[PDB]
Structure formats: structure tokens, C-alpha cells
Symmetry: C2
Subunit: 251 residues, 2 copies
């Protein structure tokens, strides 16, 4: 029979799915502010199709962000999400009022305590090995209060090919055993085994099923690594010029 709401549950990636930075848009084209930088100034935007799409989607379905952003960076997203969120590559679940889900935090803590020393050392070694290559890098450990989640590294050369080289060497030096990687644009991330958008979306669906039974689930994402959580949905979707769509084009 029917229980709860019939409307779709839609898991949406954020950066380069709902909005993007200025450098990824054609100059002068109209835009709406979607994110702020740490100094409080606009730094991410929606074009006219994008703001029309997310407005319709938020009005029509239960929309849940599934993002690499940590909680602070997610709080700089200026979109009226009302159902909570998955943050930090699946390391964090937020309730609808923005408060931290204590149960998931306990489970993630358990999965991640074997990595708490390795993560700062891995970021340090990557940033050193990057300067050894002569590359001007930038990186840090993404973390919540008390718990370190994953390592991120960016380049300042305006050449994303730099990061593919480091990934090749770090892999050969055997630094990534027990971990998986995300690479898209100027972003290279090293994630512990038990940290994944897929795991948090899997838990979100388990909880939803007790309230709403089986209802249509849709996943939207732009990265190849977003296929993890997107594969848990009944239908998945991607922007026409995404990293994922471009890879499908070449297949």
C-alpha cells in the first residue's frame, strides 16, 4: 500500500552540477549568486537554465545535497535546501535544521579512526612531493570537529594536468593502499575506504524506507566518482557537458 510521501527523493551533487565558478562560464553571461567565498563575497553562480532548474526541482521533489564540501563550505551555499544534507564526501549527515547527525558521526568515527594520523601525513607528503616536481600546490585535511575525513590538493598553475602526474607517482610509491581517489578539474582527493557519498546515500535510503517505503529515487552528479551514489538511485542524471558525460561520449 502507500505510506508517507509519493514524491521522488532526489540526491544532487553541488559544484559543477547546480552551479560553478566564474572561470567556468562564458564572460558576461547572466548569473545568480549560488555560493560565497570565505570572505563573504560571491564566488559561485547559476546561469539562467540552472536557477530555473533548481527552483523547479526544489518545488517538485525532496532534494538532498550530496557534496564534497565540508560543513562550513556547505553553509556558504545560498540555496534554500530544506531536507538536510550529506557533506564531506559522505562523512557528514546534517538534519534539516543543519544540526549534525550524531549516529552517522559515530559510525564514521569508527570507520576513520585508523586513518587519523595517516591523513595529515599524506597531505604533507603530497604537498612536498608536489614541490619536488616543481609544482605550486595547495592542500589540507578536510575535517569536522574531532574527526579528520579526507585529503584534498589543488594546483595554482592553471593546469589541471599537474594533478594527474602526482596521482601517478603517489600511486607508484604505494601511498594509497586502502583508499580511493577523486579527480575532477582542479581537485585531487584521497579518501579512506569507509568514506564515500555512496555509503551515506545508502544509509539515507535505509532510513527513508521506514518512513516513506519505496519511492522513486533520482541522482544528479557531474563527476565519474558520483556514479557511486548515483548507482543506488532508480534513475541517474548528469549535465550534458560534465566530466561523466564527456567520458560517455568517448565510449
Amino acid at each position: 500500500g502507500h505510506m508517507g510521501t509519493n514524491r521522488p527523493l532526489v540526491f544532487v551533487d553541488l559544484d559543477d552540477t547546480l552551479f560553478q565558478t566564474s572561470r567556468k562560464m562564458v564572460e558576461g553571461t547572466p548569473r545568480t549568486t549560488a555560493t560565497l567565498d570565505v570572505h563573504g563575497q560571491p564566488n559561485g553562480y547559476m546561469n539562467p537554465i540552472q536557477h530555473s532548474f533548481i527552483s523547479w526541482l526544489l518545488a517538485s521533489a525532496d532534494v538532498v545535497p550530496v557534496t564534497a564540501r565540508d560543513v562550513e563550505a556547505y553553509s556558504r551555499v545560498k540555496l534554500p535546501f530544506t531536507e538536510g544534507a550529506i557533506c564531506s564526501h559522505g562523512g557528514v549527515m546534517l538534519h534539516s535544521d543543519g544540526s549534525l547527525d550524531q549516529d552517522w558521526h559515530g559510525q564514521m568515527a569508527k570507520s576513520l579512526w585508523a586513518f587519523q594520523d595517516r591523513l595529515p601525513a599524506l597531505s604533507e607528503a603530497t604537498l612536498r612531493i608536489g614541490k619536488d616536481m616543481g609544482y605550486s600546490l595547495r592542500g589540507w585535511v578536510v575535517e569536522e570537529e574531532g574527526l579528520r575525513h579526507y585529503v584534498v590538493t589543488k594546483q595554482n598553475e592553471s593546469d589541471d594536468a599537474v594533478l594527474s602526474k602526482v596521482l601517478a607517482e603517489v600511486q607508484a610509491r604505494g601511498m594509497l593502499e586502502g583508499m580511493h581517489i577523486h579527480a575532477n578539474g582542479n581537485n585531487l582527493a584521497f579518501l579512506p575506504k569507509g568514506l564515500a557519498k555512496r555509503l551515506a546515500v545508502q544509509e539515507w535510503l535505509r532510513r527513508d524506507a521506514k518512513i516513506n517505503g519505496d519511492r522513486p529515487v533520482l541522482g544528479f552528479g557531474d563527476s565519474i566518482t558520483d556514479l557511486g551514489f548515483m548507482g543506488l538511485c532508480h534513475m541517474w542524471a548528469t549535465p550534458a557537458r560534465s566530466q561523466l558525460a564527456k567520458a560517455v561520449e568517448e565510449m
Copy 2:
């Protein structure tokens, strides 16, 4: 500024996207009739997620089928589509009341009159070459009143691998120059150059833009060949276990 409707225009494939035959569903699981066979009896069904999804989508957006079915087979689809349709692999556009679009019919006629003799001969040769292989086939020319569109061939062996063999030989005998092919499940189709879902969706969007300007366009399809029209949308989407999704999985 804003003009017309803001709601998304959603192009949806039909078979194996919104519904499927009984043999493609787990026995005994609940279902809703979605299509009738030529004898008027149910032969295609939606599972509970599928009927919930298409109901929500029809209510929330302007939904336009984009189907290989000819007009007669489309008329046996028992879903309340209200905006017209693209049929016969892009060879036919129907108005919302089901009447034939005369302009597109004239354009398709022009593209297809160099193929009017080749299509019946190609179906005959394929069905003969199939029996030469010892395979029990079935095929015909798909056509509207006066105009032949494409060739379809099916096998009766319960082995879809049979069709991949014929495609290999027919290609070597040089019978498919100036044409493209569709193969998914128990369906192998040979299409003339100017016959494509992509071309009809392209024309549909050109016409829509004069009424509604630029609004979000979403494409849903299950076949690799559906990527043609799906690439014209802002976002495209596929069922989790589709032919397309399975190919992406292997990439």
C-alpha cells in the same frame, strides 16, 4: 526576460525506460498495464516505482515521448501524454491531439525518398541471410501512410546474440552505407541517415524556443542510441540497469 512556461521540457523514451514487457520483470511482482498488444491485451507494464515516477513527471513538467514505435504502436501506449509525441525513430511528430505534423512529414519525405526501394529490399535480404544462418527471424519495414521509415528485425530463438551476428555480416557485405543502426535487446534496426530521434528533438526545441524561450530540457532514455537526442538536453538521465548504464559501468 521570461516568456511562456518556466517548467522543464522532458523528452522520454518509452520501452525499457517507462515500462517493459512481462519477461523483463521478476515473476509475480506488482504491475500496472502500460501497453496493449495488437489484439488489445496487456503486454507492457510498470512496476510500482515506474508508475509513481511517470505520474509525478507528467504532473510536474511538459513530457514528450521520443519513441521507435510507429504511430499505431504508440497509440497502444496507455499513458496520458498531453503534449504530442515523436514517433518512428524521429520520423513522425504528432500534435497533442494525435494528428500528424504535416511540416515534419514533408521534411522527412524529402530526406527519405532515396531509400524507399532500398528499405523493403534490405529487410528481405536480412531475413533471407538470417535463414541462411539457420536463424528463425522476423522483420518488416516500419512505415507511415505513403512513406517508409526504417527496417526492423527480431529473433524468435530467445537469444539476442543472434542479431549481433547478422549485424556483423550485413556490415561486411556493405549493405549499411549511408545508414546507422540500433541494437538493444531483441531489436535490430537499420535507419537511413536523415532518420534520427536527435533530428526530431532538435526541430522540437527550435519550435519550442519561439514560444517559451530557453527553458530546462531533460532527456530520459535507456539505449546507447538514445544518447543522440539526450545530448541535446541540458541534463540527461537513464534507468540504473539500462543498456546505457551497463555500458557506463564497464567504462
